């Protein structure tokens, strides 16, 4: 239904516009403003900003993204958790690196293909009208009309293509809202809204370096997409690890669809981030490394890698908040 458009005055920057049913973050990114973000889901806190003038409705007040140091300030909010209720004056430190490489849009999608990788995991491929332009390792915020007020980040598994396909592996979380849906009450022909492409943890080409991919749990999508781009780039030895709790979170490679021969998997079946240190030892620093999965598994791998020589700028990751 209807949307209102308000003025988004952002200090030090050109007057943009925000919306009444769009996060402030996706409003700014639509304007091409490199407003800091990571999860876009209320966890990282990277999208924090102060309110100089105006009002906002928070999608989720309890959001642990902002430290109570920011919360004690009182006028600080998460850009990924706010909608504009009026004209707004905000102060955020913006950075070019966040500027979208490919212009983000909200688009209409139709479920075209479903595949059960495991009982825990399900691949859904959706068709948009427009081409599916996105960088390897990026994500979309995916909404569903029947479920109002629940947007959820999901990493692209497939690669950018002219015929407008978007594929996601989603893991079933009982106790969740969105996951017990595609896993229960949805099928081919179901209608979904895709907001993207989002993410700054995408594949970097032309570094002239080895490429290591480590994906935990549902972080297979991100890890696959990177690895399946790494071999397209050079076909030099490209490494991909997978993390699962039980050896029965079925591991398949034709189901995950690469050069089976030119990609050596080291699926770890429990914590992954120890075998990676085991096999590669001190080879790490010469790799560009890419990381995805639940926050505890991801937030732990970053220090084991950082403490073992690897420069900060050589590591890339999306934590599944
Ligand atoms: C960058 C990124 C990429 C991701 N990629 C993938 C992927 O490829 N595959 C995959 O399976 N999962 C991915 N996730 C996690 C994905 O959101 C899961 O589906 C998550 O478990 C949500 O499922 P749910 O809504 O059923 O669970 P819920 O338990 O309903 O929601 C859990 C998450 O939703 C958010 N949340 C909590 N409360 C609220 C609220 N009141 N309003 C709005 N949001 C709330 C929080 O981020 C929380 O961690 C990703 C997350 C991020 C941040
Ligand atoms: S980007 Fe808003 S908290 Fe992660
Ligand atoms: Cl201002
Ligand atoms: Cl949004
Ligand atoms: Cl907030
Ligand atoms: Cl948009
Ligand atoms: Ni109205």
Author numbering: -3 to 266, 279 to 329
Article passage:
Carbazole 1,9a-dioxygenase (CARDO), which consists of an oxygenase component and the electron-transport components ferredoxin (CARDO-F) and ferredoxin reductase (CARDO-R), is a Rieske nonheme iron oxygenase (RO). The electron-transport proteins of CARDO, which mediate electron transport from NAD(P)H to CARDO-O, comprise CARDO-F, which contains one Rieske-type [2Fe–2S] cluster, and CARDO-R, which contains one FAD and one plant-type [2Fe–2S] cluster. CARDO-RJ3 is a 329-residue monomeric enzyme that belongs to the FNR superfamily. It consists of three domains: an N-terminal ferredoxin (Fd) domain (residues 1–99), an FAD-binding domain (residues 100–196) and an NADH-binding domain (residues 197–329).
The type I crystals were resolved using SAD (Se atoms) and MAD (Fe atoms) experiments. The type I structure was refined at 2.6 Å resolution with a crystallo­graphic R factor of 0.249 (R free = 0.292). The type I structure contained three CARDO-RJ3 molecules per asymmetric unit; one residue (Leu289 in chain C) fell into the outlier region of the Ramachandran plot created using RAMPAGE. In both structures, electron density for one Ni2+ ion, which was deduced by analyses using the anomalous Fe-MAD map and CheckMyMetal, was observed on this axis and coordinated by two histidine residues of the N-terminal His tag from each of the three molecules. For further structural comparison we used the type I structure of CARDO-RJ3, as the FAD-bound form exhibits activity as an electron-carrier protein. The Fd domain contains a [2Fe–2S] cluster coordinated by four cysteine residues in the Cys-X 4-Cys-X 2-Cys-Xn -Cys motif. In CARDO-RJ3, Cys35, Cys40, Cys43 and Cys76 coordinate the Fe atoms of the [2Fe–2S] cluster, while the main-chain N atoms of residues 34, 36 and 38–41 form hydrogen bonds to the S atoms in the cluster. In the CARDO-RJ3 structure, the position of the main-chain O atom of Cys35 (Cys35 O) was closest to the methyl group at the C8 position (C8M) of FAD (average distance of 3.3 Å), suggesting that this orientation would be preferable for electron transfer between the two redox centres.
